[PDB]
Amino acid sequence: PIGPEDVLGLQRITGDYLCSPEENIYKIDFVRFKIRDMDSGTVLFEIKKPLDPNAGRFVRYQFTPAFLRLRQVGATVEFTVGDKPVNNFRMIERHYFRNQLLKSFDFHFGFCIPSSKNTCEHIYDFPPLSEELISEMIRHPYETQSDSFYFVDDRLVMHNKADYSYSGT
Template sequence: MQFLCSQAGYRLVQFLEFSIKNEDTNEMLFQLKRPEIPLNWEDIDPAEEGRTVNYKFPISFLQAKNIGTTLTFAVGPKELSSFRMIERHYFRDRLLKSFDFTFGFCIPNTVNTWEHIYEVPALDEKTKKEMVLSPGQTVSDSFYFVDNKLVLHNKASYSYC
């Protein structure tokens, strides 16, 4: 797997919690929480940080019209100016949706929570069926920028069952 930058960005920001829920039904679809907040940023080994996630969602995820996400992250000893994430979702190399989220300025040594509700792209039933029958062929790239410089690049794959 190829990434567009090193893992050094993990010395700037640590992702602590992430959840996804169907806003229309209030069904929690995914939830992940790190066991602890890093206390000493110098002890973080970026090479030990995961850069890929394999999501397994219920098929009901594909019926959702509105998804809510909550992200909790810790900022290290340096401020994050113009913190931004661009995320692109693909199925078999076809762009399904692109998201552009601006977190803005983040104060050093803080824990922040960011919530966003967005519309899920409309997919035809044939595509949804193919996505269910093709685990791992729905993928995403998440690009994180500070001051317009790419500092992190993560990848995810999706399966629906």
């Protein structure tokens, strides 16, 4: 049984998925994701959802070098929920570069309407990165990786993974 305290101190990306897809007993399905730069209004990324072991749990992002100097980005997330009520829906997203923790985001979802489509806004406050780190992250695309742990009532129900490029394609 993995709880939030079990991931709040992780200093490395996990070597595997901490939970199976069947553990998503709340039928939580992310159907849309949009990232906006809060200092310019620019839509940095948008996706709409229409046997690989990842099965939709791994996403690869391709951003520009300017993304690493952003102060704050806004994430709009659309997701459906099953019949089971969802209380204390939490997401802990940890970003690492070459086994070095860079930032962890602890987001608490607002009320979730059961058996319906929900929309939430997550505000990411980026920390200032050292010039050496920014340079390395630009030179090494996809070596920046993240773990997104989703908790419902302190119980891990979803675990998604991603890697990032900041080389501007």
